[PDB]
Structure formats: structure tokens, C-alpha cells
Amino acid sequence: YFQSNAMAKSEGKVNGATLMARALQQQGVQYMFGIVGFPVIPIAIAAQREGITYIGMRNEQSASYAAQAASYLTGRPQACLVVSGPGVVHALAGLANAQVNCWPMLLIGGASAIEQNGMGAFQEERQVLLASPLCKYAHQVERPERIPYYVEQAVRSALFGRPGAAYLDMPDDVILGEVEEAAVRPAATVGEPPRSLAPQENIEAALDALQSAKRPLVIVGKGMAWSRAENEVRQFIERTRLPFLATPMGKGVMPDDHPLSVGGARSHALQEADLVFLLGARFNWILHFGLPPRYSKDVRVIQLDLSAEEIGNNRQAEVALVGDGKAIVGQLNQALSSRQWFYPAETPWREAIAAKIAGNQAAVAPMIADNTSPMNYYRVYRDIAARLPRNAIIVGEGANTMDIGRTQMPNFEPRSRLDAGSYGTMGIGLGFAVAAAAVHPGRPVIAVQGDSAFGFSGMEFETAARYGMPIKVIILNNGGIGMGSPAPGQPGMPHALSHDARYERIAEAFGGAGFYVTDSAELGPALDAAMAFKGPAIVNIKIAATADRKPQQFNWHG
Amino acid sequence: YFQSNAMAKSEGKVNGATLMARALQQQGVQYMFGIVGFPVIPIAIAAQREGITYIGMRNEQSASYAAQAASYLTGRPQACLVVSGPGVVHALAGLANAQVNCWPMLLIGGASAIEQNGMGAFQEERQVLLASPLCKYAHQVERPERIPYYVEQAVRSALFGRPGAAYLDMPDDVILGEVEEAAVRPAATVGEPPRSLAPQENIEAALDALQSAKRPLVIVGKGMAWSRAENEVRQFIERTRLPFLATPMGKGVMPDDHPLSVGGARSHALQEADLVFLLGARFNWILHFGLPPRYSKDVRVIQLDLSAEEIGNNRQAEVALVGDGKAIVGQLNQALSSRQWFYPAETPWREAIAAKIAGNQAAVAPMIADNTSPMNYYRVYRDIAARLPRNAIIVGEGANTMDIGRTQMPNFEPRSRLDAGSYGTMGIGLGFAVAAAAVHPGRPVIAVQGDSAFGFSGMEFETAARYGMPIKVIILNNGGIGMGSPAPQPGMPHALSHDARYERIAEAFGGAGFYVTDSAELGPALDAAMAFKGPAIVNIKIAATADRKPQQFNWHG
Amino acid sequence: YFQSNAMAKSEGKVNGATLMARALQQQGVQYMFGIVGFPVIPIAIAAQREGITYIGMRNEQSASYAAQAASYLTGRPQACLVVSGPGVVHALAGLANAQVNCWPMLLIGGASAIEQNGMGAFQEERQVLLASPLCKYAHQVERPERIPYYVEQAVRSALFGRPGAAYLDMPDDVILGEVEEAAVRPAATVGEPPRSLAPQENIEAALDALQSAKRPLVIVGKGMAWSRAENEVRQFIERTRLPFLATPMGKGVMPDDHPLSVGGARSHALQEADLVFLLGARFNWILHFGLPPRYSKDVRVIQLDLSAEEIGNNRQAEVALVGDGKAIVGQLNQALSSRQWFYPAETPWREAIAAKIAGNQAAVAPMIADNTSPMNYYRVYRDIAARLPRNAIIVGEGANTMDIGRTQMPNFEPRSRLDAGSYGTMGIGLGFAVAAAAVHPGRPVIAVQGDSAFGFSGMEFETAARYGMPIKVIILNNGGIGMGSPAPGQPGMPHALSHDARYERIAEAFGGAGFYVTDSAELGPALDAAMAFKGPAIVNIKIAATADRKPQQFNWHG
């Protein structure tokens, strides 16, 4: 009818939803995760018309988590789309997690019409006010002709400097409001984030300090992965022959099988190093604040970070390298060519690191070899690690499940491990997996979660099936939070869940493949069948209720 | 060993977790929904030792929704317990919903140790700052000896006046910090919320206005359900013979089968009334702001609300009745004893209401009787409504599923319907159902959700199974958000999985699962699900294009 | 007497007030402006014991403005000390002004005792929450032993990166609480803010663009004055021969009498430039957003700013130079030597600039020479400018008084003009003057305020007299806000004040010298006497009610 090409069409006007979609596409947004509804249905449809991939989720929580993981994987702010009111409130989880991890993110939240403000409109809410404490940038788009301006400013703010979350509030009457095409002020395309360099004397001072250290340690954080500095870091470590330690999501910047990794002697390396070189890593709880009882009280610090305000937190920095990871390590490699220095091939430090790695390997070897059922964590990961392709993207989530999987699942390329992060968040699991499968559909995506962690976002398995994402979900079920629990007229323990739950049947609700494992003899065949199945799958593994990690001198939290 | 009763034990000291547990119990907290972890594990354990019922959920979203539902059902603030950092941020969902619905709740969020503030500690976060815009009350507990003070003040703030959410921040070193039991200052027990009355002239002016109206309408909102005013409201309606309209969760304050209800002629009643008596209901979007095009421009308003600031919002109130719903309607009943007036037995207003009711009944009658498969919404509810016990607690969630279920599922007692509420929230479904099953285990609990709504909180079925809650989950699956979609070109943003076998989720956790696609299967499946001694899911594949009855006005406008 | 040295004393403990004083002194805080009272009296007393200069003001509003001006003048965060409750709320003015100008400052606010929280204590308030939106950093000090930690972190957060305000909340029980001196954990001394450099290809790209421009313009902002980049900028301008425009408080980075200044042809220079080089200046309202109708639609931008997120705001930047102004201009000077280029001595661009300067000079020449009484603004500034020493510190505040004074009072060294700034704030006048008199007591401090501006902070004249600060306050009184008003059965107009007010008698209330000027013949002798008076002085000049600035093609705001 009105879709006949023979009829006269106005064709001069454009509405806010369309301008938003074009601006997002211009600014490099390729993925949009969310849940539609009033008033954002036109936004999702217009985004699809511009070629943006829209992924409809089952909860805004996972959608806001998927958005920032896709941002991390692409190096580019990607979008989360939620409805007014509780849509935005649900998505506050992702804003908080993206702020704490320094990951970019664009949350687009619908709002009730401006003309109804004050009246008690449907899902009326002070949305910019609620989001502001968790965002680098948060603003309401008051008029549709200003959409290109706001999308450019929001993307730029989220991407430049220390990355973080941006929020755009889209009222209903702005989404549907129309303006003349020829009257809309265009906006420039946001390019690559600016890279800054360190002063030359800071470069030379860092090398001076490295040459003088008896027990140096390089710590590779996920700031280097975000900076895409892996080439420069690998050259720097190879030329200096310096021992290095990867952070949880810094794994892969250096290959985990590199002979200079101290990952198997982590506590001794932190305890005994006289100099620590922080590469895109913070002295927060992940690295135990750089302070006793985990470090020498007199540890010297070279700190490379883009955030000037981060320099010297908790432990003073002897040499500060403020700027971009890739750029500054490039400076170090250039300055190394004039020094002709490397850490000597034989030092007591190297011998102590090697002895500790072998001691820790012998401590967990019987647990890895133990075929008895119900299985311990290390036995389970023996079969899992042996079936992980070298280009896989690993999502890990839980307490023991995640921590033990971190040391038992090596990464050989950067940006290939996504876990609970600097916020210790449960609920990122399947959202991260959906984002990884959307961004890199040619690579296998394996999520290894505990039974508690799986419950936070397990409904998103339907999302993966609906979009043909062959995500492999492996659940390590001990029947509780961190540990199992003997079944109780006493009430159930607060940490207890269901040890006999058949989570794999959730995969069969949505056309995926489900596998249940209780004996070690079943694990191999089940994992083989799950990996070969052309589609998403769940392997539910009932592990020992009392299985625990390797004993250590220090508690992880302390 | 150290627990041998022969061993000398020092018993003088108590820590913050135990103080928190004793204070919550003293203040009437019987239910605590949450997810444990650093640092709140001692709090949940201590709560159970005091006899508090701890319910471990699967997401803090549902835990915060369950807490406010339990508060609405019990009449006292109930607790939601979450870990530091993302635990609180996940729980902000429930604070906002409780704020908007004027429902109390107490959120107890753990926090990182005070002595590590600034260091980038595990899950360090400005938690009070984040929660403050969503709460009536939000404060950190800085020392464990002040826990009785803060619990009393938080519960009192949540419960008294216009109810709302309260937040208490519990740092790790306060939870584990010890004090001498004899040195802790006790706190008074928070009693019932104060009830206030209206001036006598306002009472008389309200009754004078009722006598003068040609087309009066009483609107009964959930503020009367919160106020426990059902006895007084029923006496008021039976005395005055006035037509009434229930709001969505005001259903049941008056029985939905009462002959004075105008529910089946709702649009006509709002449009043509010359006087509206608001009982604990707002002129917000749920009542279309009391303005055109849904009301007469000159509609006269009697407004009963506890909140003085709410009086006259959008539409001016000719008579204001600021105070408690139960006390004020009691005043009206007492003042009516001196008047011979009642709304007459036969008026053109009654005839117009009755005719419009019959017209809407005949408009939906063919759909209710249509046994065509895949079924429409009204046909599905024909079998559901015939099997709902009259004392059931009904949870409704979705768009078409919820709105059509609102008209097809009558409630005969108050506080027995829990739905998306004033915030239009998807995600409250199984959290509300778990709350209802915990508070009223002797009553049946039936949640009717759309397929989209179920996806928000479906994992909480494991919670119901783990606690032996025989919740009956009925899913109306059209394969999308509000309506279905043809199979795919990428999938439509609103599309879900029409062929999904959601009922197998019940079988993951020991419940009964039922799949219905034909009308002949619906009856036997509902029979078996209601009779099964445990939780159950009935997954009904409905027509992808089934819709609600056509109306003159869109619900939103 | 308990003060006799013969008596045994404890000496082993220290309270929070003393730890705060020692930490502030260690971190380079030399000046503390505030008003004492519960609970901060011990803090100011302890600060004086460590040698910190305490300045007791008459309103926290001016104290908070003084602290940030002293921070700008010293290059390090200086302190404002206020009481609980309304003391902090009064001081929010300074936090907002410091945020908008990117100036550092440390606000120290007392709080009611922690043990009384919730009870309705005296001046109990959510002080961190109120201050947080206006601060880079805001935190409460919960225990006295962590004071060194928080002071270090607050000073560093205010000073590093883009500077801004930091707030520390000091409860009464923390101020008076005692700890063992040997158990207090020390904190490192905050050094100079880190400097970052631009990548070399960006440096060369900037020089390439400069060589290609037909009508280039360098804009020198107060970011270069903060960065102490004046010598690098002066070398760059001398070697490139580029015309330059100074921003309001950028005046002095280049001397105002420099022949390359386009200040006398500002509108034409911005309108016609084909390339603009922003040096530590933003495209905000002060530079008219870098957009039409004040700029060419195709103007090319080289942008030097420390804040990566600011790059490309309103007008896209062709070359981004993210880093420190001093460091990056140093790179440009070094890279300039590799080439053989300067902007030619004879171009149509230079002729157009010189013609507009001469035209604008001839437009105001009659007003400057007009001895008519009541005097116009330009006539008043003829006598003021002739008596301003070349090393003076000038404070300007008002509308016409400030804007006309900006062009009539040249500065020849940087950081010597303090005015309403990027926030357009009235109320900074005597607070800025007191700060300048405290930081540079060996230099003359002259504040030229309109009559409305003086009323905001005029009581601080007592502060100047109490501390022996010979501040010279010159008031231009037209009897209203922006303009005069005829005498009023009619109420006074909202902008009207008192044209016949004798503000100079305020000086005689506090021991200063007051001078009243109505005729041009009195102006010179009055200024001579005020400048020679060995103390603070007020010269109250009753100017014409309808005196105005020279007409322009565009309104300053637009």
C-alpha cells in the first residue's frame, strides 16, 4: 500500500531512532545487547536497518555485561539498550562493573516523554541522576537534532583517557520526534584513542632501576591487553629476559607457556622481589596493594599506567611512566637498543623461582592424577584443559571453579579470558560468553562456571541458542557457594544449593545438547561430544562437595 | 572439643553479625532473602540462629524483589541480604521498585573493611551514595555497638509514614567486630505505623460531595490493601451502595465478584463519572492522571492519601483526606450513621454501567469459548481461572499475559495479587512467588508469566524446589515480547523462541513439567500441575498473534 | 602548671589534628584559608604549629575561592578549612569554581562525631555526598591513623592529571582521637605532577599543518600558565613568528605588549583563521565553541590539552596533542629545528590583523582621552593602567568593569591575572586578592571590581587589614549590575544598586585608606595616594551610569 514505489513519499524527514542508529554505526558500534519495550523498540529496529547486530537478552543485567565485554574485545564502545525505569536500574550493574575494570561502554536507556515529567508517567525516573555515579559520561538527549553531537561526545568520553561507561538518556518524544534530514548537524567520527608517551628521562630511569635490581619482576595487567601492547610486551620480555607474572585477565599478553612466567611461583615472586614493574596493572586487591605481608616493605616500583592519579597508590612509585602501554613499552624497547643490557641467565632469583614452580607442580600433581569419583577440581580441569583449542575464548566465573580454572587453563593470546574481574562480579558469565560469540563467531567460546555462578545468568543460554551461538557451558557443581553442604528438621545452610541438580536439562529446553557427568570415566566422552556438537551445550559435572584449591601461605583476600 | 560443655568458655562478648540478627528479630524481621559471600555469611548464619527464615536466591535482583513482596504481605519490613559491591548494585533494582510502589523493605549490604577504604579493596564501593536516591533511609553502621540503634531507625523509617526502602551498610570489620553484651545500648521495638485522621469538616464535606454526585465512583487502590483497611472499605461500600473500581493490585480489597464492581466497564466509568473518590490510589499513569481524554474535564475528586504532598497531583482535589486509609474510612462510616443517604437503587448511572458490563462480556465471550489451537489468551485463562483456589496468591507478569490475566483472574481477599506494579517491572515474577510461598505456605501460589517475563527470573525455580515451595508456574509462550514473530534476515528484536520447552527447567530441579499446545491438553495438564506435591511449570504455546480485547484507548496513551 | 619542663610527660601519643597538620606540611600545603569553630579549631592551631600560614576569613565562600587561587599561584593544592554542616555547604562554591577552571584545591571540612550519626547531631550532614559531584576526590577520614594516607591520596588526586578539587571529611572524634606516634604509617611525599609527551608523528603532523596554513592563529590558554610553559611557548612563538591570541587568564604567558599579539583584532582573527592551534585552552564559551558564527566552518584545529576526553569537543581536531603543555611545546621546539620554516614576515594575513588593530585602537581612542565627568570606563582605566607596576597581580571582577579592564590592563608575566574565570563567578574578588597577597607579599596586588562585584566579598577587606596585606581595591561604581539606573510609587529596578554609595568608608572601618572620586581631576591623585599608602586601600570611583564597552560585531555570549 504505502510501500508501493509508484506513490509519492515525503522522504525529507528523519526521526530520533534513525539518527541514533546512524550515529552509532558511524561511531563504530557494531553490537547492541538489550531487551526491547517502550520506548526503545524503534531504536533496535533502526539499528538493525543500519547493519548493527542486535542481540535480545533475557535480563538487562547480562545485556549490560555483554556490552562491556564486546567493548573490551573490539577495542571500541559497544551498546546496551534498555527500557525506561527498571530497564536502566537493572543495567546499573554493568555500568558499575565497567567503571571498576576501566572498560568502555555505551548504555542507551529509554525515558518517558518529557512532556509528562512530574505527572507520574509510566516508568518515569531520574535516570541520569542514578547512572551518574557509575559513569564517566551521562546525559539526556533533549532534542533529536542533537543526537549526532551526543553520540559522538558519549563514545569519545567512554573511549578516550581511562575508559569507562557512558550513558545516554533517550526520551520517548525524542526517539519519535522528527527533524529535516538536511538540517541535522553532522558529527565527526571518533578515531583511535590518543596515545601518550613518557619523558625520556623517565624511560632511562626505569632502565637504570631494572639494571640495579637483584630480584626484578614484571607484572603484566589487562591494561596492556586493552592497549593492544602484546607485540611490544613480548619483545621487551624477550630482550630483557625478565621474569614476569600475568594478572588474571592479563593472561595471554605473554603466552602462558613462556618459560619466563612465574605464574607457578606467584606468592614467592611477590614476596621476594626487590623491584616490581607494573604494566597496566593496579596495586589494588588483585595484587594485594603492593604492601606487606605480600611484598617486601622496601619494594621498588616502576609503574606504567595511563591514569596519572593512579601513580603511587598504596605503594610509592620510584619511576612513573604515565601514558599508553603500547607507546611507552615501545620507548623502552628503543632505549634498550642503546643499553645492550639483559637480566643475566643465571641468578639466585631464577633458581629460587624455578624451585618454587617445581614445588607447586608436585603439590597439585596427585590431585590432577586422582581418578576417583566424585572428582576434585584439578582432575576435572585435566580433561577440560586438554580439549581447549589454542584460539579459544575462556569465560570463567565462580570461586574455586574460577580461581582453579585460572591456573589450569592457559591462554596463549591476549583478550581471550573474561572473568569476574576487578569487581569480583557473579553474573557476568553467559553475558560475556554471548558477547564473545557475537564478536568472534569463528573462535570457540567455552564458559566454565560454578553452580552458583551459572544460576545468575543461566537463562541467557536461550539467547545463545536463538542466535546460533555454539557456546560450551561447563558447570562444576559442588552444590553450594564455594563449597558443598551435607543435606540437613534443620534449615538449609545459607551457602547450600542443589548438588543433584540437572542443570544440563536447561540446554534441552532450548534445543542445545545436555551432558551429565558424575564419574571420571564419563568426563572425556562428554566433553568430546559437547565440543563436537554443532550448537550450544551444557556439561553438568557433579564434583566432590569438599573439593578445594591448593593450600597456600596466604588467603586470597587476607 | 572447644564446644565441650565441660570447657570453660568466655560468654561476655558478641559480634556485629549476632547483634544484627537479634535486632532484626526484635524488630519483626522474619524473612531474609539474599545470596551469601564476603562479607555477609556470618549475618545469614546468625539470622537463622535467631529463628529468622533465610532464603538463598539465585540473583540479588529477585532477592530484592522478594523482600519487598514479603514486606507487603507481612505488613512489616523484611530483609534482603547482599554482598559488597555488585551485590548491592544488583539489589538497586528492588529499592527502586519499592520506592515507586510505596512498599517497605530493608536492604542489608555488606561492605569492605573500613580500614581498607581508599586502597582499592575487594568490592570497595560508595554503596550508601548509590542507594540514597532510591531510599527513604540509607546509612552505614560504623561501629557494632550502634547496630540496635540503626536497625530500629531503619525499620521505623521504612515502615512509618509513606513506606519505602531502607538501606544499612555493614562493613566487614563491623560484622566481625566484638563488643561486650552488657555494654550494648538496647533499642525500643518498632510498633505499628501511626494512623492519622482527617478533620471533621473534611469528613462531612466528603459525604456532602458524595450525596450531590449524579455519577459517583469509588476507586480502591493498593494503599488500602497496605493499610489493612479492607474491613472498613467493605462496610463503606455495603453502606453507601456506591459503584467501585479496583486498581490492579487493589483487587481483592473488595471481592472482585461483588455486584457493585465496575471492573467490566472501566473505561466508561472513568470517562463519565462526575465525582471520583480515590482511596489509596494515585492519579499516575495507572489511573491515567485523572485528566482528559480518560476523565471529564470537571471531574470532582475526593482524595484519601497518607501523603499530603500527593493531594491534588495532576487533578485538583475538591475534598482532601490526608491520613491513614483504615482510620479515615472508619471516620466516614461513623459519620454515615447520622445520614439517611445512600446511593439509590436505580439511577441512569447504574443502568449505563450494567449495559457496558454486558457489552464487554459479549465482546470477549467468543474468544473465551474458542477452542481453536493454538489458543488465544482468553481461552487459556478459561481453564486457568476455573482451577484457581479462592484463597490463592496470584503473581502476574508480562504484557498481554499480565493485562488479560488481570481481568480473567478474580481476587476475593486483599493482598493476594502481586504484579508488575507502579514501575511496570519485568523480573519480579518468581521473586514475588518465592516471597508469597515463604510468608503463606498454607496457601496456593500461582504465577502466570509470559515467556519474556519468565526469562528474567526463571532460575529462581531452583530456589522454590530447594525450599519445598509448591509454586505453580504457568507460562503463556507466544515466542516474543508482547507478541510472536515469524521465523527469520536477522531475528526481530522482540522475538524469542516460540518452540522453547521451558517446562524442562522444572525437571532440572525435581519439579513437574508440562507442555501444552492443543486445547484438549490444557485441562489435564493444569489438573496434574495443581495436584503435584511440589513446584511445577506448565508451558503453554499460544497463538503468536493473540491479543487483548480492542479498546477505545491505549493503556499508555 | 603541667607546662613546667621538670614534670614527667607522656609524649608518646598524637591526635588527628596534629597528624593532619604534619601531613599537610609534608605534602607542600603552605596556606590554609578558613573560618574556625566546632570541630576544626585544633586543626588550624596545629597547622600554625607546623608553620602553615592560617588566614581567617569572613565567609567560607571567599575562603574556598582563596584556596584555589593560592593553588594556581603556587602550583600545589592549598587548603580551605571549614566547620561542619553549613561551613561545608558555604564552601561548595569554591569546589564548583575549582572544578570548572581545572584548578587544584583541598577542602578540609570538619564533621560531627561518628558515634552520634543518626541522632540529629549538631551540624550533622551528608558532607561527602554533597561535595562529591564537585570533586575529583572526596572521602571521609574514618580513623586518625589513616590521616597520612588520605592526605597523600587527596593531594595527589587534586594535583595529578587534569587538576581539580579534593575534599577530606574530618569527624570530631577523628580530630581529637589519639594514636601511638610510632604506629602511624607514613606516606610518601607527592612530587611534581607527571608530564606526558605526544607521539612523534603527531608532533610532525602539527608542524606540517602549521606550514600549510594561510591564516594561522595560536591561542594561548591558562592551561599553559598552570603548566609553567611560558618559556617554551615564548621560544615557539618567537621562532615560528605565528600570530597569537591570549585567553583572559592566559594573558601574560606571552607578554601583552608582544608585537605578534592579535588581542586588538580578536573577532577578525577568530573569524578568518584557516587554522587554530589551541594551547591549553578549551573550545567552550570563552572561545565561542570554535564554531560559526565566530569561526570559519572549515577551520582546522591543532589541539594541545592534557585531557584526552577534551580533544575534538564542539569542533573536530585535525591534530591531537594529548599531554603536558610544557613537555609538548618542548617537543615542538626541538622538531622545529629539523625544518627551515617560520611564518613569513609579509602576508595578507599580517596586513589584515594590523589594520584591524589600528581600527580598534582608533575606535576607543576618543573614549580614553575624554576627561568628561562622570568618567567612562576607558577614561578611568587610562589612569589605572598608567599606575600599574609591570609585576603587579591583577584581580578583575564585574561585567563591564572586568571585560573592559581585561583589554586595558596588560599583563607581562604569566599567572598575574585572576578574574571570574570559566564559571563567570562573582564573589572571587577579595578572596583572590587575599590569596595573591599571601602567596606573593613582595608584589603589588590590585583588584578592580564593579560595585556589584565588590558587594559579594567586600567584608574580606577586614581580613586583608588584619594580616597587613596592602591590597589596592579600586571600585568602579555605576550604581548597578552591568549598568546604572535612574532613581525610582515605583520600586527599584532589579539590577539597581547605590550610585551614591561610599564604599571607601568600609576601608576606614578597618584601618585602611579610603578615597572617593567623582571628577577626572581627582582620579590621578587618589590612585597615587592609595598606591603609596602603606596598607590596604579602597578607591571608590563614581562612573557614568550609562558607560559601556566599545561596540562589537558579536555579543560576548551570543
Ligand SMILES: C[C@@H](O)C(=O)SCCNC(=O)CCNC(=O)[C@H](O)C(C)(C)COP(=O)(O)OP(=O)(O)OC[C@H]1O[C@@H](n2cnc3c(N)ncnc32)[C@H](O)[C@@H]1OP(=O)(O)O
Ligand atoms: C508491550 C511491551 O512492549 C510493554 O512495554 S508493556 C509494559 C508493561 N505494562 C504494564 O505494566 C501495564 C500494566 N497495565 C495496567 O496497569 C492497565 O493496563 C492500566 C494502565 C491500569 C489500564 O487499565 P486497562 O485499560 O487495561 O483496564 P483493565 O485491564 O482493567 O480491563 C481491560 C478491558 O477489559 C474490560 N473488562 C474488565 N473485566 C472484564 C470482564 N470480566 N469481562 C469482560 N471485560 C472486562 C474493561 O472494562 C476494559 O475494557 P474497556 O472498559 O476499556 O472497554
Ligand SMILES: C[C@@H](O)C(=O)SCCNC(=O)CCNC(=O)[C@H](O)C(C)(C)COP(=O)(O)OP(=O)(O)OC[C@H]1O[C@@H](n2cnc3c(N)ncnc32)[C@H](O)[C@@H]1OP(=O)(O)O
Ligand atoms: C549579563 C551580564 O550582567 C553578565 O552576566 S556578565 C557575566 C560575567 N561575564 C563573564 O564572565 C564573561 C567575561 N567575558 C569574556 O570572557 C570575554 O567577553 C570573552 C567571552 C572571552 C569574549 O571576548 P571579547 O569579545 O570580550 O574580546 P576582548 O575582551 O578580548 O576584547 C574586546 C574588544 O576590544 C578589542 N581590543 C582588545 N584589546 C584592545 C586594545 N588594546 N585596544 C583597542 N581594542 C582592543 C578586541 O579586538 C575586541 O573587539 P572586536 O575584535 O570583537 O571588535
Ligand SMILES: CC1=C(CCOP(=O)(O)OP(=O)(O)O)SC(O)N1Cc1cnc(C)nc1N
Ligand atoms: C555467590 C558468590 C560466589 C559463587 C561461588 O560458588 P560457585 O558454585 O560459583 O563456585 P565454587 O567455588 O566452585 O562452588 S563467589 C562470590 O564472590 N559470590 C558472592 C557474590 C554474590 N553476588 C554477586 C553479584 N557477586 C558476588 N561476588
Ligand SMILES: CC1=C(CCOP(=O)(O)OP(=O)(O)O)SC(O)N1Cc1cnc(C)nc1N
Ligand atoms: C520485556 C517486557 C515485557 C515482556 C512482554 O512479553 P511476555 O512474553 O512476558 O508477555 P506477552 O505480552 O504475553 O508476550 S513487558 C515490558 O514492559 N517489557 C519491557 C521491560 C524490560 N525490562 C524491564 C525491567 N521491564 C520492562 N517492563
Ligand SMILES: CC1=C(CCOP(=O)(O)OP(=O)(O)O)SC(O)N1Cc1cnc(C)nc1N
Ligand atoms: C551580579 C553579576 C555581575 C555584576 C556586574 O556589575 P558590576 O557592578 O560588578 O560591574 P559593571 O558591569 O561595571 O557594573 S556580572 C554577573 O554575571 N552577575 C551575575 C552573577 C551573580 N552571582 C554570581 C555568583 N555570579 C554571577 N555571574
Ligand SMILES: Nc1ncnc2c1ncn2[C@@H]1O[C@H](COP(=O)(O)OP(=O)(O)O)[C@@H](O)[C@H]1O
Ligand atoms: N591504553 C592504556 N595504556 C596503559 N594503561 C592503561 C590503558 N588503558 C587503561 N590503562 C590502565 O590499566 C589499568 C588496569 O588495571 P587493572 O584492571 O587493575 O589490571 P589487572 O586487573 O589486570 O591487574 C588501569 O589502572 C587503567 O588506568
Ligand SMILES: Nc1ncnc2c1ncn2[C@@H]1O[C@H](COP(=O)(O)OP(=O)(O)O)[C@@H](O)[C@H]1O
Ligand atoms: N496507610 C495508608 N493510608 C492511606 N494511604 C496510604 C497508606 N499507605 C500508603 N498510602 C498511599 O497509597 C498510595 C498508593 O498509590 P498507588 O501505588 O498508585 O496505588 P494503585 O497502583 O493501586 O493505584 C500511595 O500514594 C501512598 O501514599
Ligand SMILES: Nc1ncnc2c1ncn2[C@@H]1O[C@H](COP(=O)(O)OP(=O)(O)O)[C@@H](O)[C@H]1O
Ligand atoms: N599541565 C597541563 N598541560 C596541558 N594542558 C593542561 C595542563 N593542565 C590543565 N590543562 C588543560 O588546560 C585547559 C584549560 O582550558 P580553559 O580553562 O578553558 O583555558 P582558558 O579559559 O584560558 O581558555 C583544560 O582543558 C585542562 O585540561
Ligand SMILES: [Cl-]
Ligand atoms: Cl499460611
Ligand SMILES: [Cl-]
Ligand atoms: Cl613575593
Ligand SMILES: [Mg+2]
Ligand atoms: Mg559451587
Ligand SMILES: [Mg+2]
Ligand atoms: Mg510473550
Ligand SMILES: [Mg+2]
Ligand atoms: Mg556596576
